[model samples]
Every structure is written in C-alpha cells, then in structure tokens.
Target chain A: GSHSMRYFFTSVSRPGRGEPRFIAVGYVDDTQFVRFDSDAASQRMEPRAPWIEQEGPEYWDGETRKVKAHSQTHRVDLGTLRGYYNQSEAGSHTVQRMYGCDVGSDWRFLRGYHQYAYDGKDYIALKEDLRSWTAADMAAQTTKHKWEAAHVAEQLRAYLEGTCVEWLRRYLENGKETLQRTDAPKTHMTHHAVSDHEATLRCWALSFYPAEITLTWQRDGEDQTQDTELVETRPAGDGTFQKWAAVVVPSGQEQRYTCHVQHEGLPKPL
Target chain B: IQRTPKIQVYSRHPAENGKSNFLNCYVSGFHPSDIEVDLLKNGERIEKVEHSDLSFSKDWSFYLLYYTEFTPTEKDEYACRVNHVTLSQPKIVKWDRDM
Candidate 1:
C-alpha cells in the first residue's frame, strides 16, 4: 500500500534596498510535512507541529525526530543565504546539496531530492509511475531537475526583478479601479444580551462589493482600537464581502458608542 | 433571505394649537439596513428628515424607528415612505386618522 505524497517548491524574498538582501529557496513535503527556509540563519530543517507520535513508543520523545544525534551534518554558506541539511537518515533522506553562483549574486540549493523508496529495493520510479520513459529519458529528467534546483537562486532573483515587480504594480492599479466601481457596504449597529449583565455591542458591514474595507468602534467620536475585536472579512459567494466588529462595554453606555466604517466604495464614511 | 419591514406611522401626541405633534415611523424586521425614510405631507415629500440609529432584533434582524414633528392642519394627509433594498418599490405607510 502506498500513499500519494506531494511536494512544493518555494522561493521567498524581501524586496527593497538594504544590505543582507537575499532570496530563500526551499522545498516542502506532505509525507512528513516540514519546511526548510534555505537561509543562513536556519541551521536545520524545521519540523511541522504535532511532531509527537501519538500511538507509539516515540510518543513524547521530547526530542526532534530528525537529527537524533547531531553527528552527520552538511552546510553550504553563500554570502546572503546558507544551505543546511542533515544526513542522519532519520534527518534528511529526501534532500540534497549544491551551490550555484554567478557574478555578484550567489545562491545555493539547500535541499532537493528525488527517490522512489517504497517497500525495500523494488520501488516505483517517476517514469514507471507515469508508464513512459526510456532509461536515458529518466536520466535526463533527473539531471534537469538537479540543475534547476542548484540555480533556484538565480531564477528567484530574475523573477523578483522582472515579473514580480510589474505584477504587483498592476495588481494595485486594478484594486484602485475596483474600489471606485464597487458598491458601498450596508452597515448596521446593534446590541445583544441587553438584559444580561454581560451586554456587548456589535457593528456589522455586509454585502460590500469590494473586499477591502475598515470597520472601527468609536467612543464619543474617538476610535477605540484596543477594546475592539474585528473579525476577518468573509465572502458572501456573490462577489461581495462581509465583516463585523464587536466591543464589550458597560450597560447604558450605548449612547457613546458608534460603529464607523471607511471604504473607497463609500462616497463618505458611515 | 430578504424580508420587508413592518411600517407604521403614528402621532405620539394629539395635534394641538400652536404646538407640533411628533410623528414617529416605526420600520421593523427588515434586512440589508441601508434604507431611506421619507416623510410626506398632503402626498408630497417634506424636508427635515430625522432618523434614529438602527437596532437589531433578538433574531439578528434589523429595525429602525424615526420621527419628525409637524403641526397638523385640518385635512392634512401625512405618510411615511420607506425605501429599502429588499422592496421593489417604496412602501408608504399612511397615518390613520381614526387610530
């Protein structure tokens, strides 16, 4: 019996003008589920939560599943980013190492691996699972992925410098256009449990076309951010959004409370 | 689901000489709170609209009550016209003189 495992490759970058500017590239797996933020500060692969085995002797081991002993470890340090992985078998059986750099930019492949480990030596390879590949075809695919893994840094740098910047600007411009054309939200303020001692007030904004909006609680025209808890906006499945903000206050102080909403869709604040 | 408001127009006090009678319009149990409450006299719209803050019912529904004070004449026909998103057309609740 085999489970369908999955993998995700990611690259993260903090865009701006500053020293120590770098891009982090890594891959994640759904098998054991952990993330490797391939950077200098990350000394080891981070494990996902619920690391404890509930039904086995490993329950509450109070130690990492990987890196049982800090014996066999490998690290590659590039200027802006560093790559690290442990080869303790229990540690990183699914990751590899390679560094690639060109010009002033330096990047390293902290972890990337391809294996068909299923029930001992006879395992299902990628080509076999897909049912089409010459021995040479599989070899070429493996080489291509390994090279791509090593040059992840350069790919990320180029992406951030080119398409990512333009897409962000275009997204902002589209958001502004939508804001002007979207319908204003219908806002309502009310109270609950008035007879009970724990009376609280709530203000809800519903059926707003544009998803982005601000709802704030005001006491005598002054915004009270500390005592207010605003819920995340939820979609109505009809191309609109809804949200609510609540505040717990003493009884009979409703006269001083107001729910103020601001959005570009509204001609004026409500 | 959308629901129409139960509207009622009433005079809080009897019309007196040289004294204004407070006309209150109660619009309750409606949804989608954005509404227009208009006061009409003698079948024509009047100015100086006063509205109270919207309140919620125990069932999480919304309601609002608004009023305007006006001195009544002998044959003046007063009405409260409510325009809500839920309604296809404006609902006019005329004040019953017999009530």
Candidate 2:
C-alpha cells in the first residue's frame, strides 16, 4: 500500500551562495524526483505561502495516505518565473530550467538526460536531442501566443461594436435633445456677423457628422462656397469613427445648425 | 499499476482574461511550478510572465487562471512551457479552446 505524501519546497538564505530559488527532494516509492515551489516567487519568500500548492509530484511514502515533499531538492535558478521539475517512472520525466525574461532561453526537456552545464552566465547542453527539445518548446510557445492574440482581437472588436459603439450612436440620434443647448458666444456671433456680410450662409453654417463632424452654422439650409471660417476636426481616441466642426453663425435667425452624422445604421443626413 | 502521470499547466487564478489558459504547460503532472508560460503578439515577443499576476488554473485540466489580470490584446498570442525534469519539449496546444 502507498500513501501519497507531500511537502513544500523553498529557499533559506545562506551567506555565500546567492539564495537559489528552488530546493529539492526525491520520491522513494516510484523513484520519481520532484522540485516544486509556487509560480509566485514572492509566495515562496513570504511568511505564509498561499494555502495551496502549485507545482508538485505528489509522491507516496510506503505508509499512510499523506503526501511527502511535493517540491524539488535540486536547487535551480528560476530568476523571476515560478516553476518546478519532475520525472516519470518509464523514462517519462522532465528536466526544466527557467531564468528571468532576459536571462534564460525558454526551454523544456522531454524524455532525455539532457546534461546542462552553465558557465555561471549561460546554460550549456551537449545533446542534440536536448537542443531540439528546447527548440520545439519555444515553437509551441510561440504558436499559442498567436492564437491568443486572435482571440482577444475578436473579443475587443465585438465589444466595441456591440456595446460601446452602439450605445454612443443611439445617444447621438433620437433628436429628443437640442443639438445646441445654448446660442453661440458673443465672440462667435461677432465673427459670424462679419462673415455673413461678405459670404453665403452655408459658408458660415455650423455642421458636423459622426464620421465627418463640424460645428458651423448652416445658412439658407445649405453650406456652400465663400465661407469665412473653417471648422476643425480631430479624433477622440476612443477607437470609434468620429469627426467634428464647431463654426459660428451671425444672427439669431441662423441658429438651426444641423448636426451631420454618417453611419451604417439608418437615415443619412441629406 | 503505476498511474500514468499526466503533466498540466496550473495557475492559482481564474481564466476569464486569457491569463489562465496554460495549466498543462506548467503542471508538471504532480510536480507543480515546473511549467512556464510566455506572452506573444503575432510572432513578436510580449511578456514572459509568472507569479501571482498570471498562471494556469487548478480546477480545470485545460487552461484557466484565477485572480490574474492579463487581458491579451486583439493581436496577442499565448503558449505554455512545461519542464518535466526528464520529459521536456512542451506539446503545443495547436487547437485549444481558450487559445
């Protein structure tokens, strides 16, 4: 009868050797070796490791139904990445090493002795299989990344159109609220008064579209040549289509500045 | 009979934000913490993360992270890196659900 015993692995500060993050242990029953710690390096260093085990080999000692050392006894340099190492009975073991983002080449060993030597600066492996293993690991990692990006992009696009964009457009339409809550300021009217005398009302009309927005007053219900001022347009940086134009109209009679907005929804501003 | 040990990726957090989908890449069967994960964006490198910020899920065999907040961009790609002492070379999840 075998009872799976387990324990945690951590580092204890010593004066000489730079506190290697991973400690080790061996599972006797299955001859399975283990080296584990939390994926959170900080958790390993804290006063209380979050009450759950992360990396492990869950080896059983010959007695009761308890677990022994779930971590490794072989100290490894994981840098900032939290990880462990383990071996299976029938050559189905693993040898893994990790360093910080800039320190180690993302590699994992699958079913090989994979001798690893380091010059205190880099890892050195002599076996071609080991190198191949590392390479494959990297490739697999890369592919996964691409898939994730595609997935995320899909979600973002959906959210933007289905929720954000839809809500904004609905608010803009419905004509329940006045496009201009108040009349143009004194300065606006002064400039418009001069422009009215010299040019057509359309030239001084304040007009805008969601796709091509501008706040210029429309005169005689049309904006044409001989415009005295130009309306400015800028992006709102919210990842939606937009345009703008804020123009000044001269007289109180020329206050009906229609807001122009274009979209796939309905009712084009003609 | 010795139960066939299965390696998996395991994160302590939930996986709604793409932060939890690589447990098989980290779960060293029973050897926890032996797995690694990387962040990529359309063939380019992004972040190689670990710790509490992101990880694989324990509740599921596939990918699911809890308490982690890593929302990949529309162009973000992800993968898992497992290190099983003697057995290495992580198997790519070429067609996974979360990815």
Candidate 3:
C-alpha cells in the first residue's frame, strides 16, 4: 500500500548554527501534519493540518511531551555519534531517524520500520524479524549492542506495531480527504542528443500523488530491457511524487521508443 | 522565508570514463520553494530537464530535485545553476565532468 505515516527526528551537534538543534516531523503519506522545532519560542509540537485538531487536549499535550523527550535524547545522540566517528565538535555532525508504520485499506498492518542515519549515510536499522537490528556502519555495533541490551528494540517494536499503527488509523480518519486524495501525473517525453549519433529518449511523470506508480520505457510495444534507467519515484516535497525513465537509442529512432506511465489516478498508460 | 538552497550535483551511478548515467541536481533546504534550477554542460543549460514537486521540511522550508540524462565524456563539464530570492544573483555549483 502507498499509505504510510512516518515521524522523522533530526538532531544536529551544534546550536546557534542557523539551523535547529533538534526537529521532528510527522507525516501521513506525503503530507506533513505535525512538526516540532527546537528554535520555536514556545518549543511546542504543532499541527500542520487543521483536521489534526480532532484529537483532544490530552492528545496534544501527550504528543508535545513525547517530542520534547526525544529532542533531549536526539541531542545527546548526536554528541555520542560525533565522538564515535572521531569528528570535531568545532565542525558539525548530525543524527536523524525516520520511524513509521503502514496499513492497508482494510486497516490491516502492512509494514513497520525504524532506521537512523549519521550525516547522510545509513547508521542502523531495525530488522524485519523485529527481534534485532542491523548496524550499517562499524560504530553502529556499539549502539546496536547497547540498545539491544536495554531492550530498546523491543520498546520500538511495540511502538511501531501497536501505538504507531493505531495512531496512523486515527490520523488517517481525521485527515481522510487529504490522505486518500489522488493527483494525476503530468507525463512528458523528449529526445536529447548527447553526441552526433548518440541521443537519449526521456520520459517524466510528475505532480502525482500516492507515490506508488509504474514508470518505464517501451519499444515498439515491447518492454525495454537494456540501455534504460528508471529513477525511483521521489517525493516532490509538497505531497506529490516525480519519476523518470530514459532509454538510450540511436538518433532518428525516437519514434520507436515511448515513455510508459501508470498510476491509480490515470485511466490508461500515458 | 529566506534561506539558501543547499545544492548537490552528482551522477546517479559511480561515474567512469564514457559511462552513461543521470546527472542529478538535488536543491534542498531552501525556503519559499520558488527557486529555479537548471543543469548545465560547460556552463550552458541542458535542455528538457525534468523536475520534482516542491516539498518542505517540518518548518515549511522547501526543496526540489531536478535532473537530466547524460553520457560522461572527458570534455564535458556539468554544473547546476540556482536562482533564488535569497541570492543577489544566480549561483552556479559545478560538477567535474563525471566525478
């Protein structure tokens, strides 16, 4: 299912560096519905969607408290990671995590994830077995052992499978119109000449919602195999997605190749 | 409302001599989401670039990813030019042929 709800937490080692020391965002699908930034004077967790107000004051207070706690923990996490990586505090370091759960239309749980990144590379991620974690980098071993010993993975599993999915259902219910809405992809294709005889035929699928879509290249009604590159569907920052599939072809044969696009919002392949 | 876009110009794959790959211009962390970005070859604009939707962070500052296809050659000089409201003028971030 394309439906998902994820919460992202970012913490930087430096303060007063023109960016937030810690920040958190909650998203239902591609839409950001809640946010918390350390720079805010109130230091409060705020709602980005009006429908989020359907929950009572208890819910608001509870969410704010949770992020505040995470804010403190994430700040410390950056400090530790910097030491582990043998980096200078004088420069900058970052630790970010995105954890979430997904459910299908029948309200059945589909998947759950909890992963972290140091700077821009993968650091660690919870395993599918839900009993362990995968440490991507060498230093991540220290974290994995410590977290496992503390039953942190178990705690996260509970949140992901139990609390996270239930809340996703609630948030989905409150923001149904936004969460379930669909947008059609704008498809365009072009053949750009790279050299005298070398040219690339490209196709773009943009401004689409629900993220799950099929984009590829076809040659004379046959699926293209080689000399083709299809970039993954990317979130377009404003609750939509964009994708492209390009195939290398000899010039003058552009008419033989076509861009194929499919999405839930479309009536037929475009 | 005013913030500079942190730009990254990179190839989709590990670039080697004469290897065909995609040139990506991931312009991120800017505010207002109205910035213009273009892929260039040796300082000239690459035509028919495909762009992603404008997206934002928790604070509502936005980012966009624009990309184009290319086959690396020794003489090619790829770069991304960004024009934003925060800048006095457009800034060009360079990528060496295919690094």
Candidate 4:
C-alpha cells in the first residue's frame, strides 16, 4: 500500500519540441521536502521568494524556510523536503523521494516563487534543460514516465494534441502527396495553406473499427454529396476493420473542401 | 562531514496495507565535523531521521522524492543547511512557460 501510493504520484509529461520535465509534489502528515533540479539555483537565477538579503540570487531564506530562484533552477514548487534517493550524481539521475507533513504547513515564500514561474515563457525553456539532462544522463528512461503528472495521480493527456497538430501542418492541399498505412486504427492530420479563390479545407482520416460511421463532404461549411469516393471495407485476418478517405479542393478553392469524420468520441468535427 | 537529513511519509493505497507514501528530500554538503542538519517540516524542525551523509554523488548531487497519493493542495518550503553555519549559495534555473 505504501509503495503503491508512491507509484500513484509518479507520472510522465508528454514529449514535445522540447524535453519533457517531470514534476512531483505531495504532502504527507506535516513535513515538507522540496527537490531541486540541481544545486545550481543560486549560481544563475535569483531566488524569487523570502526576500533573501544577498545581492543577486539565493536558494534559501532562513526566516521563511523556502527556496526562491530564477526560471532555470526553480521551475516547480514541490512541497517540502523529506527523504530522497540520489541515483546518479554525475549527470543522469533516477530517484524515488518522499516528503511528509501533518496539516497546516506554511510555505508562503515557496508558493510565491512558483506562482511567478508558472506562466512565464521562460519556465518552458528551463523545463527543457532538465529534460535534456535527464534524457542524456539517465538510462531506462521511458518516453513516458511518472514525473509528468497532473496533481499526484492524474495523468494528463496534456501535450498530445499540441504535438500532433505540429506534425499535421507539414501536409499541404495543392494535391500534396501524403502517405497512408493500413493498420492504423485512428489518425488525424491538420494542415494550413494559402490560396486566393476560397477557403478550402481537407481532412484525411482512417478508422480500423466497425463500419457503423459515415463520412460527409462540405463546401463553405455546408454539406455536399457529389464528387466523393467511397472504399469497401475488408476484414483482416485478426478480425479488425480498416477504411481510408482523402478530401481535396481546387488550387484556388482551398477554402471550400471540408472533410468530416463522425466518431464515438465527439460524433462530429472538433 | 555533511549533515544529511531525510524525510519520508507513509500513505496507504487502495488494497494496500499500512504502507506509507510521500515526498522525500535529502540534504548534503555540510562541511566540518560535529555540525548536524536541522530538517524543517512545514516550518518546524524534525529530528526522527538523523543528520548524516546517507548517500551523495561526488559532484554533491542529493536525492529527494516527492510522494503523495493525492496532488499537492498547497505549496511547501524545504531547504538544507548546517546549524549555525551560513548556507552555501544556491543556483536557480527558470523554466520557460511559453507553452
């Protein structure tokens, strides 16, 4: 039960243009233990909380028992510092740490530093650096792991949609040749291009499921039925299904052609 | 010798028997002998875990784990230093939040 609780809190952030930063923050009993990416906080960025008396940057304020620093070293506010396992001190690191506290623990200065770093564009860069360090130095690191979590136990599909969209933009509609595979169960791609005639849109989708759904063609956002191609569904040796469709438009009317996929999730274009 | 203090929490999971899970942080880097680390939970100091070098990397990397069955509802503060000794400077690396 105790180790399971540990498993529940560990999570992995999604992969993106930058390295994924894994963050874990938990409260137990009354003690608090906060982990730093490294001991390099006061060297580069200024600590942002507790009003340290130092001239530039400092990690701790004795009066408040908090760590405040710049975006590079202080990207998260993991409450308290309890116990830790240092996997590697040279570069790559893997660890299972514990922090506990009773109830009414006060960490105002730490919270203030975290709030300031949460929304700035710099946090992303700082997070990426840690990801780079973890990736390069560590071993057995999964594209998915336990640090990238929402809250303690919730796993957020946080970065999936954003990453998929970027890959889709590489496709263009001027009769662009796109690759397709048969075994893919569900696939979605988004592309953007410019033309003068009209606002034309295209969507290419494939579903390897039952044939209960229907596809629709639209012009200027209105439903259209002509000039559509339909493919026959075939059963695979493994008892699965497959279908493919591609919608295109005139070089000038890149604004009219719209491809719609009706599925169980939303049952409509999202 | 550095005064190393560790924090461990106990929380049970579903069908789990009396096991404890929580965040843990280890403090290292204290110099000279006789000085011990003062572990502060929330704000008060803790002494259940002794102050000694449990484990550390040659580069002075320490280990800390944040464990919780639930997400952190509020923020907490944690740091390490020898009693009556000035803390070594800390380095700060800011995260880019453009995302």
**iRMS values for every prediction:** 23.9, 17.5, 10.8, 20.1
Better of 2 and 4 by DockQ: 2
Candidate 3: stretches off by over 4 Å: A15-20, A85-87, A186-204, A225-238, A244-255, A267-270, B1-99
**Once superposed on the true structure, which residue ranges of model 4 sit more than 4 Å away at CA?**
A1-185, A189-203, A236-238, B1-99
* Proportion of native contacts present in model 2: 0.00
lDDT: worst 10-residue window of model 4 chain A: A1-10
Using DockQ as the measure, what is the rank order of every candidate, best first? 3, 2, 4, 1
List per-model TM-scores for chain B.
0.87, 0.36, 0.91, 0.32
Candidate 1 per-residue C-alpha lDDT over A97-200 given as tens digits, one digit per residue, 9 for 90 to 100: 21111111122222222222111121112231222322233333454455456753355445334443343333233334332246788877667764666557
Residue B72 C-alpha lDDT in model 3:
81
Model 1 bad stretches (over 4 Å): A1-83, A87-158, A164-183, A194-198, A225-227, A237-239, B1-99
Residue A95, candidate 2: Cα error in Å is: 16
Instruction: Show where candidate 2 strays beyond 4 Å.
Output: A1-7, A10-45, A48-270, B1-26, B30-45, B52-68, B72-75, B83-85, B94-99
- lDDT of each residue in A1-270, candidate 4, tens digit only: 011001001111222333223333221111112222222343222222121223222323431233223221322221111011222222221222222111111311110001011110111111221232122212212211334432311221222123222222221111122111122345453343435532224343443433334557777888776645443332221223333344445666645666676754344662
Q: Can you give the lDDT of residue B63 in candidate 4? A: 33
Model 4: fraction of native contacts: 0.00
Candidate 1 clashing pairs, residues 3+ apart or interchain: none
- List, residue by residue over B1-99, the lDDT tens digit for candidate 4: 233332223111111223432222223342211234443445555455432112222222233322223222225433333332333532221111110
Tell me the tens digit of each residue's lDDT in model 1 across B1-99. 356777767655435545676676767776544578888998898887675433333233445567777877777889999998788899998986323
lDDT by residue (B1-53, candidate 2, tens digit) is 01112423222222345452332232222333333444333434335543321
Each candidate structure's count of clashing pairs: 0, 94, 2, 85
